[PDB]
Write a new protein. Structure first.
Length: 241
């Protein structure tokens, strides 16, 4: 069952955290990679779960628990905006918030997750997405999960100023909302020490804190997917996946 709730937004180090939690607990962690490289069936389940935000709350909470059964932690979209509900469902779970410089975050988001509608790189991302078998339902899940995390009904995804404001507002509100001894804010570069002390575990012996999922590596993955049109053919070059 869930031991750690991760509230950090995509492109803040969530895959490195997922890897780190799996090293610490020796059990699997949710992350969107789980959805795309393992379980594309859960897309609609998240999308429908998102529209839901008393017998309404019990129905939502049971569907969250079923989606997360078998995992010890959640990172990344679409679980982000549910961090408060997860605190209620799992009262002993600790909460992590991965953060970084807002401009670095926005660039990383634009290059990997949510390119502008007139960015030429969007064309490549979409071509690689088809090689992975991702359809418009996945795109709507990404957009709706971000809107849900930001608590916005209407969001112009092409507006960087609004995304930067939403980023700062989201990170501030997590730090206001999570009881303070229940929260650890992790900045990129912090390493094992703050995470292991917060979780009260020993630092893993002789291994660096994970450094995975860079935009440089995602750009290479997209380029290789577009070139050969086969994930099986290229997976050997991307051992993290
Ligand atoms: O939770 C991490 C996360 C969750 C979901 C997604 N979906 C983003 C993508 C789809 C998309 C959505 C909206 C607009 C567009 C656009 F604009 F291109 F049309 C594309 C763009 C790239 N595609 C492959 C992929 C990259 N990473 C992934 C992680 C997991 C699963 C797949 C991917 C998915 C990305 C990430 N990140 O952070 O990578
Ligand atoms: N240990 C680490 N040190 C520095 N940056 C790290 C890191 N682990 C992950 N990152 C950065 O976190 C981002 C990935 O976050 P996520 O896994 O949530 O999608 C990437 O930013 P860049 O796109 O700027 O390279 C990646 O380089």
């Amino acid at each position: 069952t869930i031991q750690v709730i991760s509230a950090g937004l995509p492109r803040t180090g969530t895959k490195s955290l997922k890897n780190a939690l799996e090293i610490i607990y020796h059990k699997p962690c949710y992350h969107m990679f789980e959805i795309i490289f393992n379980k594309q069936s859960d897309i609609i389940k998240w999308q429908n779960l998102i529209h839901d935000s008393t017998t309404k709350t019990i129905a939502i909470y049971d569907k969250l628990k079923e989606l997360l059964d078998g995992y010890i932690a959640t990172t990344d979209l679409p679980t982000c905006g549910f961090y408060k509900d997860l605190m209620n469902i799992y009262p002993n779970a600790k909460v992590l918030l991965t953060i970084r410089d807002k401009y670095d975050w926005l660039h990383s988001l634009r290059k990997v997750v949510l390119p502008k509608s007139n960015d030429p790189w969007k064309l490549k991302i979409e071509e690689g997405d088809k090689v992975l078998g991702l359809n418009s339902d996945f795109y709507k899940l990404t957009e709706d999960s971000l809107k849900f995390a930001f608590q916005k009904d209407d969001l112009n995804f092409d507006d960087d100023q609004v995304l930067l404001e939403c980023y700062d507002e989201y990170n501030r509100l997590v730090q206001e909302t999570v009881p303070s001894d229940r929260l650890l804010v992790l900045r990129l570069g912090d390493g094992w020490e703050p995470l292991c002390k917060f979780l009260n575990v020993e630092i893993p012996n002789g291994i660096d804190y994970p450094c995975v999922n860079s935009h440089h590596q995602m750009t290479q993955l997209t380029e290789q997917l577009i070139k050969y049109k086969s994930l099986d053919a290229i997976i050997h070059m991307f051992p993290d996946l």
